[PDB]
Design a protein around this nucleic acid. Structure first.
Lengths: 106, 97, 82, 95, 98, 80, 109, 95
DNA sequence: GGACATGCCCGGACATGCCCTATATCTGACACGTGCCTGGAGACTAGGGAGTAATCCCCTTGGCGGTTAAAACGCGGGGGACAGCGCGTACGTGCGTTTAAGCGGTGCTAGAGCTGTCTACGACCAATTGAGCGGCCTCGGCACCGGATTCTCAG
DNA sequence: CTGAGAATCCGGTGCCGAGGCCGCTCAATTGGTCGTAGACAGCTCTAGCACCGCTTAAACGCACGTACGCGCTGTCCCCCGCGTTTTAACCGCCAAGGGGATTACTCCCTAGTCTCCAGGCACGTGTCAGATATAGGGCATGTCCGGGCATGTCC
């Protein structure tokens, strides 16, 4: 029987795949055993946060399936995610429904 | 007959197109422009469908963002109408001009 | 050889782009500047894309070439490959 | 039969963990894959540069942790470091 | 009556003077005290190399000069001359720092 | 503390002059101070992070050079 | 044994081919590096150095200075459209800025 | 006697003497030149590595370096650099 | 002066059609089963880069003062920021037209993609030495100061 | 036009640090050997390009009303320039300590290789949520009708 490092760690992203991608990315001649575990774990965390917010936005929109619009809403409404993705354009995301106050009627 | 006040339909269109996600630039003229510019870079180029869609998504996002910044600069000057000088200021401050 | 395709970027299309950007009123003089800006963008992006294509010994610009060009210009685009 | 590389099954498991009632479209899946690959490249590159600058030839967890602290915002960095440390400690105990 | 220049002549003279030269315009020691003060809010008992503070100071003055250039361009765009906080906020918003 | 007042009114005026402005509102000075302070928080954060990763207790010029480079503005003249 | 002569001399360049090659090998860029890559790289680096130094010298003589200072380097970089583009996001220490006054700020008669 | 610290000072001086025989260089200016050369080095080597990776190439050659130079350098600068590199590489290969 | 009839303006009911809510159809795009084989997992070996201990010296931290250029404050003022109004002109909005944008089907071949060979090409190690770097001297280009010359400005 | 403030150049004198020389030193060179991978051929097979056809939404040109950018005028207020008082910045000088970097010793952690296995990826297939379409409730907004006010005119 073979049991994987992700299974021993209780995580969802594959330790083996992240490890291989680090080994083949021409980044360093050696890679420690804990580095791909840490990296994979951070990726789960960030994915869970983004999917959490996108799901919330979908439910607010009475949608059961997340669409790119919901991803854009999630990234732009969250202050820290918008900072992290400040120079990132999501396709079919649109923009936030933001109107300047001075442009509203009197 | 009936006539809408200046400003209501503009705002309605803004809300309409900011709520939805369909592309606003026509496919065929965009492709034609891209191909025209390309002849002067390399001859008889072929372009993938997803490549033209990529250029169009990038172009529309860039122009929408530039128009957002232009609008912010115009409103800053206690104006509503965008001017060429507004575009030039936005691009200069962004650092590409 | 395609000629005068710049006229295909119509006035209402630029108006729609401005509406999505939050612009309420657009001067008639806006359009030529916008067209010039668009043209500039294209000459830079396409130059990088075609450069990659030629390095790869290809004659067809691929979606990955364009996405990579956009990334290396800081305007990284999601949805056509990573 | 041209094998490719995507995180589709793992993204779907995490989604089912956080929301076992929501699906995802092809365009949205493409956006998630682009996002994850981009983050990966950013973090791995910063960790690589960190290691080179410090005359380190091995990729270890301390450079990964520092790179995460540099790239992630405040609460995101703190929560990510906490989850990473707990997970690495549990794995190390589990061997 | 004693001599007095009209508003602006002396302003232009200092502009020419400080744009011709490269010597630093912000005081070293107060900036140094600020940097150490701000730093203990991240890590206590921190030390600083001299060339580190000089690097930070060079970076700060270059950043401020560029920001003031952009602010001036935005002010002139609005047919104004005197810069105000909303000008700074517009310059930083358009740059993508806000 | 009070040390923010060490970047005095004439210092902000001089920096603004090198930025090419002819007239400076009284409300400018606090705004400039805030902007400068925020910049410092971000730079010093990155610098100290680098210093701690190296297991050092003193922030070096090279730490600052890396912080500035990663902030998106490369500084020449201090090594690297 | 044949007399030792360097690759830089063989290529007519001043930058060290051996050192650039070593830095490419040890920069964790790839496991393998061709012989011509460091020659090409050295040639591009030498070219850019010669043009920047040429312009900085011109500025120095325009200022009646025989020694290149950072001010002359900054002037040379900013006075060249292509160098200014290449170094758009670079700040030169002790470089100052280009003398430039907007027309609206000048006095009127 | 401190540790071996590498720099381009002697090479910058040789090029300077080629282009300006009667012109000197200050230490601050030489430091700025070293920063410049190292920055360009990093940009070109990194872009070439990325280019090679993108194309599943395991060897660093002159084509990726030249293409990277063309991407990073402006038009006439790129043409002159490419011309110089090709002449230099063909002359080296003749030896 | 009293009566009469309407012009005109403002408030409210309302036409128009916009937003919102409900539901039938399908359909193609999203979710799930399968084979396998290549990447992932368990195990042994080596070696070299990382962890740790002792030194030092140099690089940073700390302190007094003077004194002078810079910082802080008082105050006249005038010119630029800001509010208000005219205008006219170029832009928002409505409508007929055509013009091309968009979708469905088929060509097929240029061109993208996968695999076979091997030979030029590059990794890797021993000996060497000559280019490259640390340390010291000095003198000349640059910096500081004083004075006459010139630039510029505002009354 | 002209006196006054400030920038500039010329000259003298100092000064300190870059360029040259020397000694040390370590990695580039030359040589050879062996893995390896990508250039070129060759085959496959995907969709890009072009064409044709049709339908229908959008562009365009024009007519028309109208809202504010710009220009002008008035106001005011509050920052610039100058003078006076202060004060700490910076250079100078000197003690002290502590940790960055160096060298040495050890050790343990992962590349490498081998062997085996399992899960992730085209392919295929089921099936169901939203695009499309039509119909009904409810309400925003500019528009038109009715009522009231007001001032003009005749007897």
């Amino acid at each position: 029987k073979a049991k994987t490092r992700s299974s021993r760690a209780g995580l969802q992203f594959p330790v083996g795949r992240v490890h291989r991608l680090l080994r083949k990315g021409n980044y360093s001649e050696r890679v420690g055993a804990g580095a791909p575990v840490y990296l994979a774990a951070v990726l789960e965390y960030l994915t869970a946060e983004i999917l959490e917010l996108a799901g919330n936005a979908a439910r607010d929109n009475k949608k059961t399936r997340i669409i790119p619009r919901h991803l854009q809403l999630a990234i732009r409404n969250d202050e820290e995610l918008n900072k992290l993705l400040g120079r990132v354009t999501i396709a079919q995301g649109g923009v936030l429904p933001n109107i300047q106050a001075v442009l509203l009627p009197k | 007959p009936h006539r809408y006040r200046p400003g209501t339909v503009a705002l309605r269109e803004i809300r309409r197109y900011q709520k939805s996600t369909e592309l606003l630039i026509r496919k065929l003229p965009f492709q034609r422009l891209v191909r025209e510019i390309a002849q002067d870079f390399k001859t008889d180029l072929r372009f993938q469908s997803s490549a033209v869609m990529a250029l169009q998504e990038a172009c529309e996002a860039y122009l929408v963002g530039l128009f957002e910044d232009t609008n912010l600069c115009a409103i800053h000057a206690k104006r509503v109408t965008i001017m060429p000088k507004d575009i030039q200021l936005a691009r200069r401050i962004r650092g590409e001009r | 050889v395609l000629r005068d395709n710049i006229q295909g970027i119509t006035k209402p299309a630029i108006r729609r782009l401005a509406r999505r950007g939050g612009v309420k009123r657009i001067s008639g003089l806006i359009y030529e500047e916008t067209r010039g800006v668009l043209k500039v963008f294209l000459e830079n992006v396409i130059r990088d894309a075609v450069t990659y294509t030629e390095h790869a010994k290809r004659k067809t610009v691929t979606a990955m070439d364009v996405v990579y060009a956009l990334k290396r210009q800081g305007r990284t685009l999601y949805g056509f490959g990573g | 039969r041209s094998r490719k590389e995507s995180y589709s099954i793992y993204v779907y498991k995490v989604l089912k963990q956080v929301h076992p009632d929501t699906g995802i479209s092809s365009k949205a899946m493409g956006i998630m894959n682009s996002f994850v690959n981009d983050i990966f490249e950013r973090i791995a590159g910063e960790a690589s540069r960190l290691a080179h600058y410090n005359k380190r030839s091995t990729i270890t967890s301390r450079e990964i942790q520092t790179a995460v602290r540099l790239l992630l915002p405040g609460e995101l960095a703190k929560h990510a470091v906490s989850e990473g440390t707990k997970a690495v400690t549990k794995y190390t105990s589990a061997k």
